[PDB]
Design a protein around this nucleic acid. Structure first.
Length: 50
DNA sequence: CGAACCTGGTCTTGACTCCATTGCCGGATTTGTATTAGACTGGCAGGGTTGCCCCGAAGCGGGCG
């Protein structure tokens, strides 16, 4: 629950404002953010981990 | 077969107690209203990034009495 990257919050995009393109894995994530671990609900890609 | 009983209540009567229920009556408190004389004179201030769809509004190029 620490080391968690969360792209939603005040100043950040909400889930209804969330497009499909922010939730993908850009190839700059390699070594900076894990492509595997993300919550499988309606938050897939908005919440990650370092 | 009758006498006398004592006991199931049935009901009343009177005397006494207690207790609510207004009734003043005065003080406490509670709520409303008014009044303060130097001068003072035009707001903060924030967010906001989806996408698609339907429709209505404003405008610009096109011709015309």
């Amino acid at each position: 629950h620490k080391r968690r990257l969360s792209a939603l919050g005040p100043g950040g995009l909400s889930r209804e404002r969330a497009g499909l393109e922010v939730r993908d894995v850009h190839p700059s994530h390699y070594g900076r953010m894990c492509p595997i671990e993300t919550p499988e609900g309606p938050n897939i890609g908005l919440i990650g981990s370092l």
